[PDB]
Curated annotation (Swiss-Prot):
Its main location: membrane. It is a multi-pass membrane protein. Changing R115A: Reduces methotrexate uptake. Reduces IRF3 phosphorylation upon cGAMP stimulation. Changing E105 to A/D: Reduces methotrexate uptake. The lineage of its organism: Eukaryota, Metazoa, Chordata, Craniata, Vertebrata. Changing L54 to A/W: Reduces methotrexate uptake. Residues 33-46, 95-98, 161-165, 239-250, 301-306, 369-376 are extracellular. Changing Y232A: Reduces methotrexate uptake. Reduces methotrexate uptake. This is Reduced folate transporter. Changing Q132A: Reduces methotrexate uptake. Reduces IRF3 phosphorylation upon cGAMP stimulation. It catalyses: 5-amino-1-(5-phospho-beta-D-ribosyl)imidazole-4-carboxamide(in) + (6S)-5-methyl-5,6,7,8-tetrahydrofolate(out) = 5-amino-1-(5-phospho-beta-D-ribosyl)imidazole-4-carboxamide(out) + (6S)-5-methyl-5,6,7,8-tetrahydrofolate(in); 2',3'-cGAMP(out) + 5-amino-1-(5-phospho-beta-D-ribosyl)imidazole-4-carboxamide(in) = 2',3'-cGAMP(in) + 5-amino-1-(5-phospho-beta-D-ribosyl)imidazole-4-carboxamide(out); 3',3'-cGAMP(out) + 5-amino-1-(5-phospho-beta-D-ribosyl)imidazole-4-carboxamide(in) = 3',3'-cGAMP(in) + 5-amino-1-(5-phospho-beta-D-ribosyl)imidazole-4-carboxamide(out). 2',3'-cGAMP binds at R115, I116, S119, Y131, R139, Y228, S267, Q323, P327, T330, K339, C342, F346. It comes from Homo sapiens (Human).
Length: 402
């Protein structure tokens, strides 16, 4: 039966690749592996030389991987994302120098640029009458797969007492299997821009006059340029708060699973907020950004190794508060946008957020710029979120006055 094969062999394989491609158990523990006894990097060498090229190359590969995903019909970039995740874990386990780890974060930004591959693959594959059910099953498989990767990464180092190098070998076994699964993915017969089955500047300029598309895209290019700077460097900060060498009380996987679990809760709890709290939208940003300005300052202030579990809660609540706004951000941006225009508005919001993130990494974090340590960067990121929270708060009172 063609309808029965379309669910028992294609949707069940879409969700299985959506589950298995997220399984990287040693992904939360990359930075304790770099700063551990195995690779033996200095904390001033990961913060200022290895991690700022995670933002440099992400600016370099965002425009190619956005165009090569639509031109190659979304499957070989899903194969390239698996083949770049292998090259990350190969350079983790075979590279010893800093240029190998700057090449490791080069390929890690190709995987970050190809996160747009899988969610836009389900759109061009599935018929639009059955798309929202398959995409609902597919996003519920990458949500379970991201959560159970960090749980499996946490249960091996803590319950199993597995070393970090043996964890990255288990993570290589789950990643070459994700390359094999990406070869058997059904290629879609259409795409969004270059391969269409069978104006956009006119539809953009009309929708650019919307008060919520201009507000929440200016949130996207400044708050996500500061959200993605904390999540690059909070694993270097936890190696300054509690610089342990146990590899069993590291707990970076439980903080990346609780930020997925709570982040899915606030993502779901923001579904009732996308339409109701839509006019009070500059005050809703300013309430969350000031919460993000205090949680980053709480990360920047905590220095005792006994208080490391305050730094885990100050990051789960940080990612849980950012994931309260995305739901509201993507709804108000993509409310009256065409789907071909929605992929380009989010394609330039993610690009201009990378433009800002490249500016702040070169000034604050890079050794060719200033080269601040990771505790002094987080004081600068806290004052970045504070002078951003008062801009939307003054905007909530300038428009609240009228
Ligand atoms: N409309 C929405 N409703 C509820 N939650 C939302 C949401 N949009 C984003 N989130 C949450 O924000 C996180 C990062 O979003 P970002 O768009 O910057 O980076 C995204 C984006 O580049 C891409 N992506 C996700 N969904 C997409 C979609 N429907 N269409 C195109 N690209 C998508 O994957 C990355 C991470 O997605 P992931 O969900 O694992 O992680 C997402 C998700 O948990
Ligand atoms: N992180 C992201 N990066 C770039 N673009 C993004 C994005 N998240 C959503 N978009 C785009 O915004 C459109 C409307 O988002 P909405 O949140 O209202 O309704 C969304 C949202 O509730 C949900 N959703 C989308 N991405 C999600 C994610 N990463 N995690 C959980 N739910 C997601 O699917 C619904 C329709 O998605 P669809 O693609 O057909 O249409 C989506 C999608 O193309």
């Amino acid at each position: 039966d063609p309808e029965l094969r379309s669910w028992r062999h294609l949707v069940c394989y879409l969700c299985f690749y959506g589950f298995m491609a997220q399984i990287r158990p040693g992904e939360s523990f990359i930075t304790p592996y770099l700063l551990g006894p195995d690779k033996n990097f200095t904390r001033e060498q990961v913060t200022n030389e290895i991690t700022p090229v995670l933002s440099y190359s992400y600016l370099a590969v965002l425009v190619p991987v956005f165009l090569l995903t639509d031109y190659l019909r979304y499957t070989p970039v899903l194969l390239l994302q698996g083949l770049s995740f292998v090259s990350v874990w190969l350079l983790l386990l075979l590279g010893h120098s800093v240029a190998h780890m700057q090449l490791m974060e080069l390929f890690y930004s190709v995987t970050m640029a190809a996160r747009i591959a899988y969610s836009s693959y389900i759109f061009s594959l599935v018929r639009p009458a059955r798309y929202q059910r398959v995409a609902g099953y597919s996003r519920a498989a990458v949500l379970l797969g991201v959560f159970t990767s960090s749980v499996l990464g946490q249960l091996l180092v803590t319950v199993g007492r597995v070393s970090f190098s043996t964890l990255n070998y288990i993570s290589l076994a789950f990643l070459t299997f994700s390359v094999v699964l990406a070869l058997f993915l059904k290629r879609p017969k259409r795409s969004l821009f270059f391969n269409r089955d069978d104006r956009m500047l006119r539809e953009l300029g009309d929708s650019l006059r919307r008060p919520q598309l201009r507000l929440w895209s200016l949130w996207w290019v400044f708050n996500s340029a500061g959200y993605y700077l904390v999540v690059y460097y909070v694993h270097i900060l936890w190696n300054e708060v509690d610089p342990t060498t146990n590899s069993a009380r590291v707990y970076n996987g439980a903080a990346d699973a609780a930020s997925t679990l709570l982040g899915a809760i606030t993502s779901f709890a923001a579904g009732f907020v996308k339409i109701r709290w839509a006019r009070w939208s500059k005050l809703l940003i300013a309430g969350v950004t000031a919460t993000q300005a205090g949680l980053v300052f709480l990360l920047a202030h905590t220095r005792h190794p006994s208080s490391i579990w305050l730094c885990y809660a100050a990051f789960v609540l940080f990612r849980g508060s950012y994931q309260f706004l995305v739901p509201i951000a993507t709804f108000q941006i993509a409310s009256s946008l065409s789907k071909e225009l929605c992929a380009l508005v989010f394609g330039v919001n993610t690009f201009f957020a990378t433009i800002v993130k490249t500016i702040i990494t070169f000034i604050v974090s890079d050794v060719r710029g200033l080269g601040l340590p990771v505790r002094k960067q987080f004081q600068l990121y806290s004052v970045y979120f504070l002078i951003l929270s008062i801009i939307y708060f003054l905007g909530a009172m300038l428009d609240g006055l009228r």
